[PDB]
Amino acid sequence: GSSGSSGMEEWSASEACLFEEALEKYGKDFNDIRQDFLPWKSLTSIIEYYYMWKTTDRYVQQKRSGPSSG
Numbered sequence: 001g002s003s004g005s006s007g008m009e010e011w012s013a014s015e016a017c018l019f020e021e022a023l024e025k026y027g028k029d030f031n032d033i034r035q036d037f038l039p040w041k042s043l044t045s046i047i048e049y050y051y052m053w054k055t056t057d058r059y060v061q062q063k064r065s066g067p068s069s070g
Contacts, residue, residue, distance in 0.1 A: 011049060015041075019049055 015038070022033040030043050038046060 009045070009048060016049070016053075019046060020053070023050075 018037055019033070022037045026032045026037070030046050034041055034043050034046055
């Protein structure tokens with residue numbers, strides 16, 4: 001079992017949750033987190049996700065019709 005920075009970063013459900021809770025608990029301190037929260041994970045590597053998280057709500061739901069009034 002090995003790993004290598006290639007293609008596109010791929011996190012795990014558990015990992016994702018860990019981060020979120022890491023912010024509410026620790027905050028904008030990637031260090032404090034990467035320290036205990038996620039030792040293996042990298043400092044920046046953890047940050048990258050943050051963006052993908054804040055950029056959420058991107059056409060996640062399907063289109064739907066409305067009242068079409070007007």
